[PDB]
Amino acid sequence: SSFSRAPQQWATFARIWYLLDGKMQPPGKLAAMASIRLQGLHKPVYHALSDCGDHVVIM
Amino acid sequence: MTGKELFEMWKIINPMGLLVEELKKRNVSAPESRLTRQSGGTTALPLYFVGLYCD
Amino acid sequence: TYSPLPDDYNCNVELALTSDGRTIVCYHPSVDIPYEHTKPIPRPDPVHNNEETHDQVLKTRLEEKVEHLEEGPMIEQLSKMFFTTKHRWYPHGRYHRCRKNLNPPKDR
Amino acid sequence: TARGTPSRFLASVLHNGLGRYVQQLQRLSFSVSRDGASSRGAREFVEREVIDFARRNPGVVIYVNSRPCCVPRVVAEYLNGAVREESIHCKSVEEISTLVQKLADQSGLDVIRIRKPFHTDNPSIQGQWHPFTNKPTTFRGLRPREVQ
Amino acid sequence: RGRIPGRQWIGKHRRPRFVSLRAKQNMIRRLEIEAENHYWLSMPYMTREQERGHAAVRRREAFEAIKAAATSKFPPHRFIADQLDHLNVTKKWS
Amino acid sequence: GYVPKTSLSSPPWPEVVLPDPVEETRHHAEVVKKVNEMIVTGQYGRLFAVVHFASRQWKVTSEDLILIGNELDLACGERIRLEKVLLVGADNFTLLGKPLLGKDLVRVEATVIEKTESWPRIIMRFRKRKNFKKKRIVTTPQTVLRINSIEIAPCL
Amino acid sequence: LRNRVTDRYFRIQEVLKHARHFRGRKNRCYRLAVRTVIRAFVKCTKARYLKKKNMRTLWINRITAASQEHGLKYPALIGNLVKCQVELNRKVLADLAIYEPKTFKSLAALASRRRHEGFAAALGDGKEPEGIFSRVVQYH
Ligand SMILES: [Mg+2]
């Protein structure tokens, strides 16, 4: 690490873009993964005040 | 000195030049920067990761 | 052979139990990103300010980017820039403005 | 309530236990009455216990003013500048001894909501979490749906 | 649209409830604990004629202690020293 | 006992084959010799520890603070060996206890700084239409510890 | 008027100083500030149990996130970690998940290996070895 403070916090709280295919999937099983990664629940730095959301791109 | 990073006390200006001078002393050739991880180049809040490779 | 987790990301664990039996030992050196998993840095060198007559006309051209919008289109532009909605970029009253900490505590 | 009072983070004043421990109390200013029943416990405290208290922890300077007052007080001054004034009006000898001992123990920071009772100054060692921890790299760093 | 006539949990027409798997498994484990209690109560040790007076002395001593604590109830003592050291209220510097 | 391949013939999870226990015991001996040599030659730095103390568990490093909510009958300035260290860890190796590590491996030292009360915490009850209104103000005692050193020994 | 009350303003201030930060006429008038300060103190007293519950639910969410990064579910991690006799509570597990991810990968590898040992013990009833990262340490 050792990661000077503002680069470190930028690295921790950054946004990530995700791609998820459709093509013979049920919409609910796509919606579950999209809901988890839109809320940011897949991160251990999660908190509902922290706005730790990610982008989800479904094709 | 507890809880403070190094360059919060030294406050250098050009770290890459000091780094290539330091590697000039240690007989390691020259660090080339290669792009390692990135997440969103087109937006207004990117994130990059540059790693410095020596040989 | 058998490893309980994939050993390509973050770390490489070996789990060991002591001969006494009373303490579990985990050895985990970090794994680097090797050289062939990196693309080189793009080098943007865009230069189209040179016209042959003057030389400091390009320095004149350097400040040619200014725009004025009213509150509506500016809010729509910020909303499509940062992927939020419109309700952030409106102001607040005096009451909500003047009861906010300007000297907040600081851990670390 | 905690929204109605200020709050601070848990902190040492000048990194006490790291090097040498220093007594964070500077002064105790006593104001007791010669005549007057309200200062009877403090009168007996000045009789018997303030001499042993002054010998016990010598970093503190103790003053006894002996002033006509309807309410006796003790003013405790700390190293960081704070001033804590407490009234010893109609108390026992044991209560005043407990009060000056508790003033001798604590440090001069505010007694407000103390907000996350731990102060790691380098909390991570193996490296703090970022979303590219626990993620594998791919050959030449290609993104999904790439061509070359 | 799905309306039950008033106060769904009492009366003639009620909102129906159904038994989950949670409820059956909970009731089953409680029934197993109760069957084990039925077992361990089934073999006594002293057969009701050998216990006839085996604890009479301890019970009589316990009730005699209760009775002795009950009948020994009386005002507390009163002393000269308390009445005289109330005069310490107006102690000045001596 | 043969079933041809269908969707439900075999279990969906991949078949795991745990190793032979003799070679695994020799491998455990090799790894603990590696980690013991790393300790004895001094290849660590800024190790942390998880410590059980005053009914809580404190993820603790050197030079920090912990504040516990009870007196300790200890004058300030006195040093303390916090026992019950149930995880120690440097970079590149950790050691787990079962549940507690040995007393000879890890040794956590701690100094007491400050013995204070708390800010006044309000306790109030209320029941409507019953004329019920109680109120208390409670300041519990507190103690501040400062974790000086987390040493480690090669007895393993 | 024999002995009518003089220090009424200090009682009004004693109630109003906990209501300076309210909204509306509750920060000024005593008849309204009393009811809102009473409800505020009852909420402050009842909030401690909700604080402890919400903090443990937050720890459960963070541990579920980190373990699902490692391909493990939360019940598998907690159960098979307690079956190796390591008694780490949810607070230090979430703090290890955020700040020490190598130690969390070591713990997830331990929980997955004890899970696999339990599965092979279920197929074999033991016979021989009852695993390795089983065999609890016995205290007397
Ligand atoms: Mg109805």
Curated annotation (Swiss-Prot), chain C:
UniProt-annotated location(s): Mitochondrion
Keyword line: Mitochondrion, Ribonucleoprotein, Ribosomal protein, Transit peptide
Record-level GO BP terms: mitochondrial translation; translation
GO CC terms, sorted: mitochondrial inner membrane; mitochondrial large ribosomal subunit; mitochondrial small ribosomal subunit; mitochondrion; plasma membrane
Domain of life: Eukaryota
Chief location bin: mitochondrion
GO function term, MF aspect, one: structural constituent of ribosome
Family: Belongs to the mitochondrion-specific ribosomal protein mL42 family.
Quaternary structure and partners: Component of the mitochondrial large ribosomal subunit (mt-LSU). Mature mammalian 55S mitochondrial ribosomes consist of a small (28S) and a large (39S) subunit. The 28S small subunit contains a 12S ribosomal RNA (12S mt-rRNA) and 30 different proteins. The 39S large subunit contains a 16S rRNA (16S mt-rRNA), a copy of mitochondrial valine transfer RNA (mt-tRNA(Val)), which plays an integral structural role, and 52 different proteins.
Protein name: Large ribosomal subunit protein mL42
Organism: Homo sapiens (Human)
UniProtKB/Swiss-Prot annotation, chain D:
Domain of life: Eukaryota
Signal peptide: none
Tissue expression remark: High relative levels in skeletal muscle and testis. Lower levels of expression in the heart, brain, placenta, lung, liver, kidney, pancreas, spleen, thymus, prostate, ovary, small intestine, colon and leukocytes. Expression is coregulated with TWNK.
GO terms under cellular component: mitochondrial inner membrane; mitochondrial large ribosomal subunit; mitochondrial ribosome; mitochondrion
Subcellular location: Mitochondrion
Keyword Mitochondrion set for record: yes
Keywords: Mitochondrion, Ribonucleoprotein, Ribosomal protein, Transit peptide
GO biological process entries: mitochondrial translation; translation
GO terms of molecular function: RNA binding; structural constituent of ribosome
Family, similarity comment: Belongs to the mitochondrion-specific ribosomal protein mL43 family.
Self-association and partners: Component of the mitochondrial large ribosomal subunit (mt-LSU). Mature mammalian 55S mitochondrial ribosomes consist of a small (28S) and a large (39S) subunit. The 28S small subunit contains a 12S ribosomal RNA (12S mt-rRNA) and 30 different proteins. The 39S large subunit contains a 16S rRNA (16S mt-rRNA), a copy of mitochondrial valine transfer RNA (mt-tRNA(Val)), which plays an integral structural role, and 52 different proteins.
Protein name, as recorded: Large ribosomal subunit protein mL43
Organism: Homo sapiens
Residues of the full protein shown: 2 to 149 of 215
From Swiss-Prot, chain F:
A GO molecular-function descriptor: structural constituent of ribosome
Keywords: Mitochondrion, Ribonucleoprotein, Ribosomal protein, Transit peptide
Localization, UniProt: Mitochondrion
Subunit structure: Component of the mitochondrial large ribosomal subunit (mt-LSU). Mature mammalian 55S mitochondrial ribosomes consist of a small (28S) and a large (39S) subunit. The 28S small subunit contains a 12S ribosomal RNA (12S mt-rRNA) and 30 different proteins. The 39S large subunit contains a 16S rRNA (16S mt-rRNA), a copy of mitochondrial valine transfer RNA (mt-tRNA(Val)), which plays an integral structural role, and 52 different proteins.
Range of the intact protein held here: 49 to 204 of 205
Record's protein name: Large ribosomal subunit protein bL21m
Stated family: Belongs to the bacterial ribosomal protein bL21 family.
Organism: Homo sapiens (Human)
The keyword Oxidoreductase appears for this protein: no
Any one biological process term the GO annotation gives: mitochondrial translation
Transmembrane domains' residue ranges: none
Single GO cellular component term: mitochondrial large ribosomal subunit
From Swiss-Prot, chain G:
Gene Ontology, cellular component aspect: mitochondrial inner membrane; mitochondrial large ribosomal subunit; mitochondrial ribosome; mitochondrion
Protein's name according to its UniProt entry: Large ribosomal subunit protein bL20m
Predominant location category: mitochondrion
Keywords assigned by UniProt, alphabetized: Mitochondrion, Ribonucleoprotein, Ribosomal protein, Transit peptide
Signal peptide: none
One Pfam family in the UniProt entry: Ribosomal_L20
Assembly behavior: Component of the mitochondrial large ribosomal subunit (mt-LSU). Mature mammalian 55S mitochondrial ribosomes consist of a small (28S) and a large (39S) subunit. The 28S small subunit contains a 12S ribosomal RNA (12S mt-rRNA) and 30 different proteins. The 39S large subunit contains a 16S rRNA (16S mt-rRNA), a copy of mitochondrial valine transfer RNA (mt-tRNA(Val)), which plays an integral structural role, and 52 different proteins. Interacts with OXA1L.
Gene: MRPL20
Subcellular location: Mitochondrion
InterPro entries, per database record: Ribosomal_bL20, Ribosomal_protein_bL20_C
Top-rank lineage group of the source organism: Eukaryota
Source organism (scientific name): Homo sapiens (Human)
Family: Belongs to the bacterial ribosomal protein bL20 family.
Molecular functions (GO terms): RNA binding; rRNA binding; structural constituent of ribosome
